[PDB]
Design a protein around this ligand. Structure first.
Ligand SMILES: Nc1ncnc2c1ncn2[C@@H]1O[C@H](COP(=O)(O)OP(=O)(O)O)[C@@H](O)[C@H]1O
Ligand SMILES: Nc1ncnc2c1ncn2[C@@H]1O[C@H](COP(=O)(O)OP(=O)(O)O)[C@@H](O)[C@H]1O
Ligand SMILES: Nc1ncnc2c1ncn2[C@@H]1O[C@H](COP(=O)(O)OP(=O)(O)O)[C@@H](O)[C@H]1O
Ligand code: BEF
Ligand code: BEF
Ligand code: BEF
Ligand SMILES: [Mg+2]
Ligand SMILES: [Mg+2]
Ligand SMILES: [Zn+2]
Ligand SMILES: [Zn+2]
Ligand SMILES: [Zn+2]
Ligand SMILES: [Zn+2]
Lengths: 333, 360, 334, 368, 358
């Protein structure tokens, strides 16, 4: 179809609204902004009212299907917004979506919002049914590498001058929380109409609202950033994440890394990575970890992880975060 | 002879009487004066920081005959009816009381009906993070398109449990825990207006013991006045804070490191008078030593949990070689191992501290 | 369940006490897995619920006998954990306790069998305490366990402890040879690994677990001469960590016996492996490795929900560290 | 006759009766005198220190018919039905039955009602730490501001389990465990008031036996009175507690230090016939050893008691270096831990003592 | 109506209780003097008399011949309490009933006047097994119960009880019964029941039961059940799987000289005889202790084992005391670890082989 990014949808929308729009991504802010832009353009082009339906195992598909053929007594045009579940569609929902796609017409600016679909969901009848003229917008969260560029670009968009230090601080405090990041940018613009947000001007108006997953901590350990790892642990603990899943992902990737380090003296790193099915984006990070980490450090990490799991699984679970921080520090030397 | 509680008698009535949170007050004033008020305001701070006070003041600004503004008036009808807690359409809800999706739905059936008085129908939900996920989703669904005169005010101590999607619907404010200076100045003003004799050192002790919360400072001030017959001297506050002291493990570590046997004995006897379990004391001593070792490894090992005693912890990390930390940790580990079979554990913990002091 | 030949004399030593009318209401049978304690409990329950016994044996087609064979005897009680769990809860024994208060449906005895007293939660044991101490008239209990010491003290205080002595080694070897057909050294290995329990030897031989033992033996044949014990991971981490760790610890024990020369060892099927273990490893290192293996097996058996793979990997890494010269080795203490 | 239990009969009924807790007593009396009565109280202390009794006394003081007095003043109707356990203003609530918010809400919707013949509706939410977080935040609003006639008295043992938010809106008062001298003084008061003869040594032993609470001291005193025939003696108290004569254990530790075996054997086989449990013999020896270790630490750690053998405490402290004391204590502690697995308890104690003898730092057993 | 030794010989009066005089004296004097508590916790190990003493107290408290320290045993209340059919004596198992509704049931039941007896008595067994909810909700009813309600508690370990529960109850610690008291009780029971017995068998049974009379009676019942209803030395030895000092002495002398062949062969022969490994280690520790005794003082030697004292004195002479202490500690640790070993024989072999490498 037409696959675009949030910075391209604004230009695309002035070329004429399409039959359907699919907003795919894990970032709530990008999805919200793209949906708002689509709705504003639709209102400009004559779409007055809008209908919202969250897809649930108890979705009133008859109501929405009637809505496809529901005309407008006092209104003229109409949109139709669908909120996909966190796991995406299945057989029944995809069949319903195929029927809805068959029900599109001049009206029905069908809008689809949710998280990115998998390759299996990619190869589906409904997806191919609107595969000629629909517009798909990718709305994934920028990662650690591209976050400073993204926040600088948005600050330029919002007529705000930002420094490198302020960009780093905003990326640090609101990583994975770009909703709070945009709210912070708006707050800083409101508090200071000058727009020159120096480092002290942003240090006094931000709070540690960043959200992380266990994989973020695993990658921080592999890169060796002790401070980032400890920050991720603090954020995960304040969020209330169960330490067991952290220990599980740590165990899985640490066992894989121990196998790699053991086999390094036998087979080159490329073939070892290939055999163990290592993703390309993390091969350099894991090779750096293998180079930095010694066999003694790996044995000590395994020992500490085993002690931590034994402490947890014996129904005590007391001060497991201290042991996790100890392991994090140990793996970053 | 009223002698009412100083906590609520001194709740702020105008925005100029709120200590700290200056950026939040400026943002609220700017939204009330020139801009259009956002359809939902969420507040997140610490215990006794000002959240509900700020929300109530904002609701007072919303409903008033002078109009929607920052500093509306004094002693008006709506402002007084809010200050007395008797306002009709200023709904006050505890989220924990109505976590059920059915009760939440019943609460959200009231938004359609027009306000009885004023302009805006204001809902004030406390500890909003405790709402169930279904109730939270219903709240978001009613927040996306609220009525033109219906507004929501939400407060929570820990916003980390709130899903990120709440940021998509409401404008959030974070209130910074007050420092020693602001709390001390506000307590000084309160005591000066109430004609309470006091000393600056007593105020400093109260502020430091408050740990950032002004409600804690006011409660401690009330206790100090009650015990001291209004004469709030340094010695009175110091003694009554020592009665409430629970930093025994940290002081034990500090004194045992300094090879101060008499100090350790006095502190352990005080802990015995406190009726503290000895196994818990020893395990938290082990935790303190482990934290010292970790912050020695890297300055970032510390967090905000120990942000009350972080100064002494930094000094301990700076001054104590890691070998001494390892020796002390081993000594306390074997002491905890041998504690159950020892005599009455009040003396087993003592003798474990003895063994620790032997490494001098 | 199944009956065993050597198992008869103990049954005759208990059913006679029960016919004399002087039998204890709570009999705790201590027997290793595969010994056949379930056979005793079931046969005794059938005799007890039988109306007119025939020479201390179940009498063919009695009404009690018929309802025992059908498995729906109203006065019969079975206490076993639900197949989706490994513990016996409070409610499972509570319903037994509350429904035991009524009279026997057929007017005979009221017999209760706890399948494995070790699986009993301490709360279930404490609940069963009252009924074991002072049961109603014509009420009998039967408990089984691998080791009575693991049971609650006050639980076993109320029961007469019977012991099922394993059959003589030669008799057990003859029985195994009659059932399975292979070399006598394999039979000896199975028996001495099963602590003299021939039923456990049958269980080991019939399943694929013996082939896994052979795999572990090969992995050790490569593992000890090169200091590559980590490669044993795949040989140990298949839902049977207690059994594989038991075999490994017994191999280490046999090597230790080979040091302090002994006429008999367990792993007689692999004398070359035992010789390699003894020659290539320091005796103190063998002590440390055997102790650590036993401790890890105990931790695997005790803690529920633990990760087998992480524990076995840590065990292997610790063994590798112990192999290096100049390492401080652990010793049991306190 | 009936002789109602000492705890029930001799429960304090006035601030001139409560022993210890000078801080909370002064706070309550002074606040009531000044009329600054907070709406939320948190009495926190170990068991049996007086939280419930002091709370009842405060409730009496608030609702005296004569007026608002610091102590419960001239006991009028309200006060005397309070002391009888009958309701005038005391809603005594166990928190274990109202942990769920579905019951805390029921409690809260009843608070807005005038009290009957009382000036306040005094809520005594005991073991308040047992509530659920939902219930805490539900009654949070009522705690911050209750009706004028509603007072909250919360009593609990561990204030750490409480959320910090509810901890903010409460006057915190911590009740220290009572010293042994105060406990003995109270027990002497009770026995003089009950016309029962008592011995100073027995009272001292009972006061030491109680771990800083007077409830345990009173239960132990009742048990000692039952052991006697309306009197308490050193023999009766020692038999009740099981503690042996300090001369025996002290002679045994002396003989172990002096490294003579025959004296140790004589002492142990004399102690066998006295019916003293061997594990308590080991416990007493370990307690003594740690006592000499503490004497070594400081002359402050002797004990007001143990005067009959204090000179010998000091002599043993002077003679023996701390390393030997540590060695003996470790040996005896390991022996006591190993005692359950010894062939016999006497066997285990004898072998532990002989092990301390064989590994004696200065005079070990002769070897071949 | 046959009853096994334990329940058939349950104490029925204060004069029938073995030992526990330190609590019986206080109990009788409290009954006589009129000083009666509302809450009694009888705590001790298994088979020492907590339930029996509690039932005797219940009988004495509400006898219609008045509150007496010597219940008649023929009155209506005494017989009903003895048979367990008395309504005012409610016997509760804490593990079975540990719920909020059961606590509310107790709380609203204690408010009604007793049906038959003077007092409504609650006998809760294994009280430490209640939930913290139940403990905290029952604080007041144990602190200030109604005038007609008295509570009896019985736990195996007071340490697991909340300390505030212990504070508001009368602590009766039941000492484990001495070997002589236990043996005399077996002798009296067997004489009253006309069962032949031998003093050596009684001594073995008393020593085997770790200071618990219920265990002694269970082992006794086992002895009657094996060997045509006679308590003989041979039958008791076969039941307990014990061995004389000769085998254990041979094992110890083999181990002390580091004779791996002899130690392993002796363990093999011991396994062939089907002996008790726990008993073998017990004899190991006993013989090592007697070796240390002979080392300490020449006259501190047993007289029964005069046949084996010849090698005994030589071994005590030729071995330093420290090595004997090390062997004793190693064997004790092995005995402690024995239940957790993959096999009992495997664990004792581990212990002995560890002792060899000294
Ligand atoms: N910024 C502030 N200015 C004035 N009083 C305050 C402030 N913050 C807290 N307080 C005092 O604490 C009491 C409770 O405050 P509250 O705002 O409810 O704290 P919370 O953030 O925990 O809900 C108020 O009545 C007021 O007396
Ligand atoms: N300060 C005290 N003065 C006198 N007696 C006390 C004191 N504290 C506890 N007691 C004794 O303990 C009994 C129960 O005390 P209580 O006040 O219930 O302690 P708690 O704080 O644990 O509820 C009282 O009857 C009294 O005999
Ligand atoms: N002191 C004793 N005197 C006589 N028999 C006793 C004694 N202690 C225990 N027993 C025997 O043990 C059996 C169980 O005693 P019980 O009192 O239930 O012990 P427990 O304290 O563990 O509940 C009794 O039936 C009795 O045979
Ligand atoms: F009301 Be606050 F959050 F303590
Ligand atoms: F109220 Be107390 F802890 F006995
Ligand atoms: F078997 Be008893 F009640 F400890
Ligand atoms: Mg609040
Ligand atoms: Mg009992
Ligand atoms: Zn106004
Ligand atoms: Zn039949
Ligand atoms: Zn009065
Ligand atoms: Zn009678």
């Amino acid at each position: 179809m037409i696959r675009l990014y949030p910075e391209q949808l604004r230009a695309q929308l002035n070329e004429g609204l399409r039959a359907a729009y699919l907003l795919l991504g894990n970032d709530p802010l990008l999805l919200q902004e793209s949906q708002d832009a689509v709705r504003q353009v639709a209102a400009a082009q004559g779409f007055e009212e809008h209908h919202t339906f969250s897809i649930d195992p108890n979705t009133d598909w008859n109501a929405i299907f009637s809505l496809c053929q529901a005309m407008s007594l006092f209104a003229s045009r109409q949109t139709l917004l669908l909120l996909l579940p966190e796991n995406g569609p299945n057989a029944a929902i995809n069949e319903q979506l195929l029927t809805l796609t068959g029900l599109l017409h001049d009206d029905l600016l069908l809008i689809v919002r949710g998280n990115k679909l998998s390759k299996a969901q990619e190869n589906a009848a409904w997806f191919t049914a609107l595969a000629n003229r629909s517009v798909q917008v990718t709305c994934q969260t920028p990662e650690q590498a591209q976050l400073p560029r993204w926040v600088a670009a948005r600050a330029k968009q919002l007529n705000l001058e930002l420094d490198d230090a302020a960009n780093q601080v905003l990326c640090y405090c609101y990583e994975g929380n770009l909703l709070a990041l945009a709210q912070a940018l708006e707050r800083l613009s409101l508090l200071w109409p000058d727009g020159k947000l120096t480092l002290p001007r942003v240090e006094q108006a931000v709070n540690d609202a960043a959200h992380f997953t266990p994989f973020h901590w695993v990658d921080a350990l592999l890169m060796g950033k002790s401070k980032r790892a400890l920050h991720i642990l603090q954020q995960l603990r304040l969020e209330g994440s169960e330490p067991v899943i952290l220990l599980r992902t740590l165990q899985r990737e640490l066992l894989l890394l121990v196998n790699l380090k053991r086999q390094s003296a036998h087979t080159p790193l490329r073939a070892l990575f290939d055999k163990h099915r290592v993703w390309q984006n993390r091969r350099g990070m894991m090779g750096e970890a293998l180079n930095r980490l010694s066999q003694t450090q790996l044995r000590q990490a395994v020992q500490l992880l085993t002690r931590t799991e034994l402490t947890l699984k014996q129904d005590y679970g007391q001060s497991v975060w201290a042991e996790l921080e100890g392991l994090s520090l140990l793996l970053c030397h | 002879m009223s002698y009412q509680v100083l906590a609520r008698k001194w709740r702020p009535q105008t925005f100029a009487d709120v200590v700290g949170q200056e950026h939040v007050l400026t943002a609220l004033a700017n939204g009330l004066s020139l801009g259009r008020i956002h359809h939902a305001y969420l507040f997140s701070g610490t215990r006794g920081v000002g959240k509900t006070s700020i929300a109530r003041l904002l609701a007072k600004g919303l409903n008033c005959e002078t109009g929607i503004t920052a500093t509306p008036c004094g002693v008006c009808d709506n402002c007084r009816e809010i200050e007395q807690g008797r306002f009709v359409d200023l709904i006050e809800i505890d989220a924990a009381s109505r976590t059920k999706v059915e009760d939440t739905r019943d609460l959200l059936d009231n938004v359609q009906y027009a306000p009885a008085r004023g302009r805006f129908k204001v809902y004030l939900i406390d500890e909003v993070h405790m709402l169930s996920r279904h109730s939270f989703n219903a709240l978001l669904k009613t927040l996306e398109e609220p009525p033109e005169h219906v507004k929501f005010l939400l407060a929570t101590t820990d916003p980390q449990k709130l899903p990120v999607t709440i940021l998509s619907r409401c404008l959030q404010f974070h209130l910074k825990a007050l420092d020693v200076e602001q709390i001390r100045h506000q307590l000084e003003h309160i005591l000066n207006e109430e004609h309470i004799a006091h000393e600056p050192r007593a105020l400093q002790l109260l502020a430091r013991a408050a740990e950032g919360s002004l409600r804690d400072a006011l409660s401690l001030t009330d206790q100090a006045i009650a015990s001291g017959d209004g004469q709030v001297s340094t010695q009175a506050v110091s003694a009554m804070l020592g009665t409430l002291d629970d930093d025994q493990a940290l002081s034990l570590v500090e004194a045992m490191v300094e090879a101060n046997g008499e100090r350790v004995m006095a502190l352990i006897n005080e802990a015995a008078a406190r009726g503290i379990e000895w196994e818990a004391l020893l395990v938290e001593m082990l935790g303190l030593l482990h934290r010292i070792a970790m912050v020695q490894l890297s300055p970032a090992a510390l967090g905000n949990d120990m942000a009350a005693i972080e100064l002494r912890m930094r000094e301990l990390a700076r001054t104590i070689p890691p070998t001494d930390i390892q020796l002390y940790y081993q000594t306390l580990l074997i002491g905890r191992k041998e504690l159950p079979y020892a005599p009455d554990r009040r003396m087993g913990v003592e003798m474990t501290l003895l063994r620790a002091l032997a490494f001098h | 369940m199944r009956w065993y030949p050597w198992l008869r004399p103990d049954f005759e030593k208990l059913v006679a006490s029960y016919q004399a009318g002087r039998g204890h209401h709570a009999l705790l049978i201590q027997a290793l897995p595969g010994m056949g304690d379930d056979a005793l409990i079931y046969a005794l329950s059938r005799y007890l619920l039988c109306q007119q016994p025939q020479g201390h044996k179940s009498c063919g087609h009695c009404r009690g006998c018929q309802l025992m064979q059908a498995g729906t005897h109203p006065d019969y009680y079975t206490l076993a954990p639900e197949k989706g769990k490994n513990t016996l809860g409070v409610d499972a024994v509570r319903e037994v306790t509350e429904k035991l208060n009524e009279h026997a449906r057929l007017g005979g005895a009221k017999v209760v069998w706890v399948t494995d007293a070790a699986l009993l939660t301490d709360a279930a044991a404490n609940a069963l305490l009252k009924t074991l101490e002072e049961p109603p008239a014509e009420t009998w209990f039967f408990l089984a366990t691998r080791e009575p010491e693991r049971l609650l003290a006050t639980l076993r205080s109320r029961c007469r402890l019977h012991y099922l002595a394993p059959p003589p080694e030669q008799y057990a070897v003859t029985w195994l040879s009659r059932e399975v057909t292979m070399s006598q050294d394999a039979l000896l290995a199975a028996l001495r690994l099963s602590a003299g329990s021939p039923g456990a030897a049958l269980a080991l031989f019939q399943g694929d677990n013996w082939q896994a033992r052979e795999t572990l033996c090969q992995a050790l044949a490569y593992s000890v001469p090169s200091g590559d014990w980590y490669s044993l991971l795949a040989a140990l981490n298949h839902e049977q960590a207690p059994a594989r760790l038991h075999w490994l610890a017994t191999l280490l024990m046999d090597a230790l016996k080979r040091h302090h020369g002994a006429a008999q060892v367990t792993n007689v099927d692999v004398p070359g492996l035992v010789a390699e273990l003894a020659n290539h490893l320091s005796p103190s290192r063998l002590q440390a490795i055997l102790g650590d293996v036993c401790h890890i097996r105990e931790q695997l058996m005790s803690v529920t929900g633990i990760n087998r793979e992480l524990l076995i990997t840590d065990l292997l890494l610790r063994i590798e560290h112990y192999l290096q010269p100049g390492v401080v080795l652990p010793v049991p203490h306190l």
